[PDB]
Design an enzyme around this catalytic site. Sequence first.
Site, PDB file in Angstrom:
ATOM      1  N   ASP A 117      -3.948  19.286  42.921  1.00 15.89           N
ATOM      2  CA  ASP A 117      -2.728  18.492  42.795  1.00 15.89           C
ATOM      3  C   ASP A 117      -1.650  19.270  42.056  1.00 15.89           C
ATOM      4  O   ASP A 117      -0.919  18.718  41.226  1.00 15.89           O
ATOM      5  CB  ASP A 117      -3.005  17.165  42.089  1.00 15.89           C
ATOM      6  N   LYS A 164       1.745  20.491  41.232  1.00 16.88           N
ATOM      7  CA  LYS A 164       3.068  19.949  41.512  1.00 16.88           C
ATOM      8  C   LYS A 164       3.919  20.030  40.249  1.00 16.88           C
ATOM      9  O   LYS A 164       3.387  20.274  39.159  1.00 16.88           O
ATOM     10  CB  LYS A 164       2.962  18.510  42.025  1.00 16.88           C
ATOM     11  N   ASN A 201       3.029  18.449  36.831  1.00 16.40           N
ATOM     12  CA  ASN A 201       1.906  19.025  36.106  1.00 16.40           C
ATOM     13  C   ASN A 201       2.188  20.438  35.608  1.00 16.40           C
ATOM     14  O   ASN A 201       1.257  21.127  35.179  1.00 16.40           O
ATOM     15  CB  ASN A 201       0.658  19.018  36.992  1.00 16.40           C
ATOM     16  N   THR A 247      -0.787  15.270  46.568  1.00 14.78           N
ATOM     17  CA  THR A 247       0.545  14.720  46.740  1.00 14.78           C
ATOM     18  C   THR A 247       1.094  15.145  48.096  1.00 14.78           C
ATOM     19  O   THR A 247       0.987  16.325  48.457  1.00 14.78           O
ATOM     20  CB  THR A 247       1.483  15.191  45.615  1.00 14.78           C
ATOM     21  N   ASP A 279      -3.030  17.976  33.627  1.00 16.88           N
ATOM     22  CA  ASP A 279      -3.633  16.894  34.397  1.00 16.88           C
ATOM     23  C   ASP A 279      -4.628  17.394  35.435  1.00 16.88           C
ATOM     24  O   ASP A 279      -4.264  17.682  36.580  1.00 16.88           O
ATOM     25  CB  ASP A 279      -2.554  16.046  35.076  1.00 16.88           C
TER      26      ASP A 279
HETATM   27  C1  6ZZ Z   1      -3.180  13.682  29.605  1.00 22.45           C
HETATM   28  N1  6ZZ Z   1      -3.701  14.701  30.578  1.00 22.45           N
HETATM   29  C2  6ZZ Z   1      -4.810  14.363  31.492  1.00 22.45           C
HETATM   30  C3  6ZZ Z   1      -3.105  16.037  30.620  1.00 22.45           C
HETATM   31  O1  6ZZ Z   1      -3.499  16.843  31.366  1.00 22.45           O
HETATM   32  C4  6ZZ Z   1      -1.941  16.360  29.649  1.00 22.45           C
HETATM   33  C5  6ZZ Z   1      -2.024  17.233  28.547  1.00 22.45           C
HETATM   34  C6  6ZZ Z   1      -0.715  17.212  27.937  1.00 22.45           C
HETATM   35  C7  6ZZ Z   1      -0.151  17.867  26.811  1.00 22.45           C
HETATM   36  N2  6ZZ Z   1       1.112  17.617  26.520  1.00 22.45           N
HETATM   37  C8  6ZZ Z   1       1.857  16.783  27.245  1.00 22.45           C
HETATM   38  N3  6ZZ Z   1       3.243  16.588  26.823  1.00 22.45           N
HETATM   39  C9  6ZZ Z   1       4.251  15.871  27.640  1.00 22.45           C
HETATM   40  C10 6ZZ Z   1       4.137  15.779  29.035  1.00 22.45           C
HETATM   41  C11 6ZZ Z   1       5.110  15.099  29.785  1.00 22.45           C
HETATM   42  C12 6ZZ Z   1       6.178  14.542  29.091  1.00 22.45           C
HETATM   43  N4  6ZZ Z   1       7.245  13.818  29.796  1.00 22.45           N
HETATM   44  C13 6ZZ Z   1       8.649  14.167  29.457  1.00 22.45           C
HETATM   45  C14 6ZZ Z   1       9.686  13.192  29.997  1.00 22.45           C
HETATM   46  N5  6ZZ Z   1       9.527  12.816  31.351  1.00 22.45           N
HETATM   47  C15 6ZZ Z   1       8.402  13.289  32.066  1.00 22.45           C
HETATM   48  C16 6ZZ Z   1       7.142  13.667  31.283  1.00 22.45           C
HETATM   49  C17 6ZZ Z   1       6.232  14.681  27.683  1.00 22.45           C
HETATM   50  N6  6ZZ Z   1       5.294  15.327  27.014  1.00 22.45           N
HETATM   51  N7  6ZZ Z   1       1.347  16.148  28.317  1.00 22.45           N
HETATM   52  C18 6ZZ Z   1       0.074  16.349  28.677  1.00 22.45           C
HETATM   53  N8  6ZZ Z   1      -0.696  15.846  29.704  1.00 22.45           N
HETATM   54  C19 6ZZ Z   1      -0.189  14.855  30.762  1.00 22.45           C
HETATM   55  C20 6ZZ Z   1       0.865  15.643  31.683  1.00 22.45           C
HETATM   56  C21 6ZZ Z   1       1.534  14.634  32.313  1.00 22.45           C
HETATM   57  C22 6ZZ Z   1       1.675  13.431  31.171  1.00 22.45           C
HETATM   58  C23 6ZZ Z   1       0.637  13.582  30.272  1.00 22.45           C
END
Ligand code: 6ZZ
Length: 291
Positions: free
Chosen positions: A126, A128, A131, A167, A147
């Site tokens: 996935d 994209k 991610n 996607t 993700d």
């Molecule tokens: C939780 N899982 C399984 C993960 O792989 C993972 C590890 C992560 C480590 N740091 C972040 N920081 C972060 C990420 C997106 C945003 N947003 C800013 C404003 N609009 C759009 C997005 C803000 N802060 N995110 C993480 N993620 C995920 C990635 C997608 C969301 C959560």
Amino acid sequence: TDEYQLFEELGKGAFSVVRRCMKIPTGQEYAAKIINTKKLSARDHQKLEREARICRLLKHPNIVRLHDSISEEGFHYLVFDLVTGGELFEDIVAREYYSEADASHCIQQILESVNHCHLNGIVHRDLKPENLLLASKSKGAAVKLADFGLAIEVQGDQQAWFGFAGTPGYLSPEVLRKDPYGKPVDMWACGVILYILLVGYPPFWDEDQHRLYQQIKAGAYDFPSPEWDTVTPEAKDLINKMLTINPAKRITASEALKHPWICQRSTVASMMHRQETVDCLKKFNARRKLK
Ligand SMILES: CN(C)C(=O)c1cc2cnc(Nc3ccc(N4CCNCC4)cn3)nc2n1C1CCCC1
């Protein structure tokens, strides 16, 4: 769990939620995926421990870091080191200078994370923009692949029908034909991403999702004038080799990291500013934010 304080929502899922959290006694910030384990299928229960196992295995500067896995009464937390630089694609549209060299720098980092996944028998499935994050607001923040909720484990180079996941805009031809597949699907997605990084719009697109899939299966992309007239032939070559329909002849991640446009970036990639790409990406990001 009681050790963490929960804040705003960073994402949403069928049976899960992602929230910014902080380790109370030390103040370290994380991104916690909170899964309600109650009333959870056996299928969904194996997917959850597969994601925890996959993330625990991946330690790479261009992949998010799993900090902790926690099982509580009715909830499970997947705690990752928080990255604060936002989406790579939203950072690019905020830049005053953006060229092939920058795109080559970004794809090189994405290719390192994909290559490190595939060397450990892991297919993300996935890839994209959502991610693809940036480590910090620092000038030279590293790209972070995130993700792995849809990632699968594979043995060597053995293909198989692992399911219809991903996607639509980034789906490979072999997944659409419901053929057995594997690591090459990530490289088809990298081709789509690289195309978007150069001109700011996807190589395959249609209002009707059924027409989109016929485009993808046929490899019906091109390099239209005038915006592609200034893209180097080596950049189009790398895209071509990623968007190759035959999965066996599609370039692998280790081969792409040795492509002249990637490893000889300073003398092969163009340095010219591509403002029209920045402008298109701004529209591309706006359309994404609707869905
Ligand atoms: C939780 N899982 C399984 C993960 O792989 C993972 C590890 C992560 C480590 N740091 C972040 N920081 C972060 C990420 C997106 C945003 N947003 C800013 C404003 N609009 C759009 C997005 C803000 N802060 N995110 C993480 N993620 C995920 C990635 C997608 C969301 C959560």
